[model samples]
Target: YMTNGIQAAVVEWIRALDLEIISLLLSRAWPMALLATSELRWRPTVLTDTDNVVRLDRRQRLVRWDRRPPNEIFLDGFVPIVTRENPDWEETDLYGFAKNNHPSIFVSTTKTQRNYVWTPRNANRGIVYQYEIYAPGGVDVNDSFSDASPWPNQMQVAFPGGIQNIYIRSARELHNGRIQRIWINPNFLDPGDLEPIVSSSRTPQVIWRMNHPDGGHRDQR
Candidate 1:
């Protein structure tokens, strides 16, 4: 009977642990479990001031050609101060010294080939950063962003489909390859059907063959 009671105590502990765990609903959509990691180490990045003194920025950055989970954005978060007068969507910049969010875009071709691309328009110093992920993009439809008119809305922001509860995990590449005028998605990711849900002539299509001058299997890049 004492041996049986020992088993009972162990069972009791297991049951209590299960109760607390199941109560916690599944989380993390940005980068799924196994692949959730930043390819770019959160190490010190170099920066230059007006004096051209190249010094290490006081922050660990996710720079151009860098990759990280969306969670980092919430923890370290982007700057609260944004440039647009009364903006629509949250504007942020890793290069906080830029004093304003630079121009960036999300190109969604397929579930896989979707991407985030940005350039520093304001800052020429500090963290000198860029971001890219294979998650859903804000540019669901074309005309999403125009430098001149009809400024960007929430729809054109990165992670357009609500950065919560997402599937279709894709990997980030430390480097991307270019084939002629066509730029390939990182990790050989696909730009799936022109429009996954609807057919659109507006959305551009890279030839199914990707216009391979060497019969499509050159695979050199």
Candidate 2:
């Protein structure tokens, strides 16, 4: 190390330039290197379509069936379908309404009744579409349900070309006896009047007026 002023100045300049190169590498090169590694990690895996994927899965399924007995075999090969529901057990029925479904039961106490009792079985239906109110000359509330209550005063049947969902065959009388809100229970009584109403009598007997109501507020499935 010769300590001349010019030589010292030249050495100092070289050292300063080395520090600038290191600063450039730290600021720019390192960031680019990091991004390059990230892009490699993010690259989508590519594969040839020529490989027989279906056959591979089929072979695996065949190997799985080694211990199990052979079941329904088809045209080419057979793969036993595993279902979430029980295979040996019978399917849930109308009785399953209270069994499987979460029903809102009346758990209240009254003077006559102490225990719980069911009101009605309505699934996926917790709200009323429409109803007829008690009045003399009041216009009947248009039943929006295409599957409306097949009864007197309100009979609405649109889509599917037949009555659905609703089963009405009974009458509810208010404070007075003469005025009765007629609904029918299909068990004992049927809306027999509608058959005649469609024919000779030429009157609205549970009435057959060719009018369809606008469906619900929003489109239904």
Candidate 3:
């Protein structure tokens, strides 16, 4: 009887341990799945600023490019603050110096060929920055394209469907302000249908905005 009890105890322990492991794995996996889908949605990006001394705004959201996220916005023509000590400098140069002390502004684009393209008008300086992403003619969300596939390869798709649940992570900044994450839900079009939930004709309202007291984040309209 004692031997039987010992065998039962061992079996129970093994089962308990197995259950624990399974529980732990699932807890971790679900979060990652929620953060990003299995398929790739972000496109390759090019940083317009690098060599020049760049600065970010007080509430600037440290954006991470799909590829090499642009680190800093280099000032176009600005010198160090020490130059201000010189009394002979022109007034505009002094203004430029002050401007350089702040973060530089830049427009970013994906290397991947897109069906639609958007640039935010107010994205220049201390203001909130935004952009739009969409499948040009639409895409097949169910299609499984290889990660190594070229940008041109994915622009066109089989049974056109729009992309949804896309989220981009932001780097944590110094301010107590919250970090920014851009979420997008591209409007999907039925293969042979002309009318969409949102029309592409008139103004092409592709971008949606999310806001709080601190500032706003980008989203699909």
Candidate 4:
């Protein structure tokens, strides 16, 4: 609900301050008030109080959780994007429905050897954010595949401070050795090393960082 970006009072101060100091001061504004209560229509973007390597567009803020790309899109196979609706369920409790509903087994083949697999184990370990990727009917997923004996690709980390749905015109790959994985960022640090944006006075979880790359910042619950 910050209509014209930063308020007039802040803007006046910014005129007299440097960009670094302005950014740091702006970073202190909490996002909790915007994200909570369900009344405000705060979209997802990047965080602020950061270096200048990443950015985000306006439409990208309204990211749909279900349409997120698979972690394996960075690879050559497919993966499940399910997240825990109830944290109470044990690891054994998951996959029972998926197994019963759609039973798929390799049991044999060379290319099949590289089949995609998803387990219930990696839930909530804080490794990466949970998301699902689905290509459209006319979209070509082949560009995501490589013909070389060894594939070269990189794996990207999920946003710990925020969530977003971004698009890639072409597939990205990061090479290592015999096995090369695909990912969004090759350097992993190209986006800049930043910390979670918190409030100046750390009381309750009042402030949050924008997921937007270009100072993708905002207030939150």
User: Whose lDDT is greatest here?
Assistant: 1
Please give, for residues 153-217, the per-residue lDDT of candidate 1 as tens digits. Answer: 21122221122111211212212332122122222233342223212354333322223342122
Off by over 4 Å in 2: 1-90, 93-95, 102-127, 130-213, 218-221
What is the per-residue lDDT of model 2 for residues 1-221, given as tens digits with 9 covering 90 to 100? 11111111112222233333322321232234433442111001221111223211101110010111111111111122211223222221111111232221101100101121112233124322111111001011112111222232211111111011121122222111122222222222232322111122322113111121211111133
lDDT string for model 3 (1-221, tens) is 01110111112222233323322321232235332543322111211112232211111112212211112111011111121222222221211221232221111222222122222233332323222222221112112233422242222221101112121212111112222433222222222322133222432222323332232322234
Please, what is the TM-score per model?
A: 0.21, 0.16, 0.16, 0.19
Clash totals, every prediction: 1, 6, 5, 29
Candidate 1: Cα lDDT at 142: 16
Tens digit of lDDT per residue, candidate 4, span 1-221? 12111111111332243433423332223234422421211112332101333323221211111112233222222222222222222211112211231221100001100212132232322223222221111101112122211221211111111111222111211111111212232212122232332123422221112331211211132
Off by over 4 Å in 4: 1-84, 89-166, 177-221
Positional deviation of 74 in candidate 2, in angstroms? 41
Better TM-score candidate (1, 3): 1
As for lDDT, the candidate ahead, 1 or 2, is 1
lDDT of 1 at 204: 34
lDDT of 4: 0.21
Local distance difference test, candidate 1: 0.23
**Ten residues in a row with the worst lDDT in model 4?**
104-113
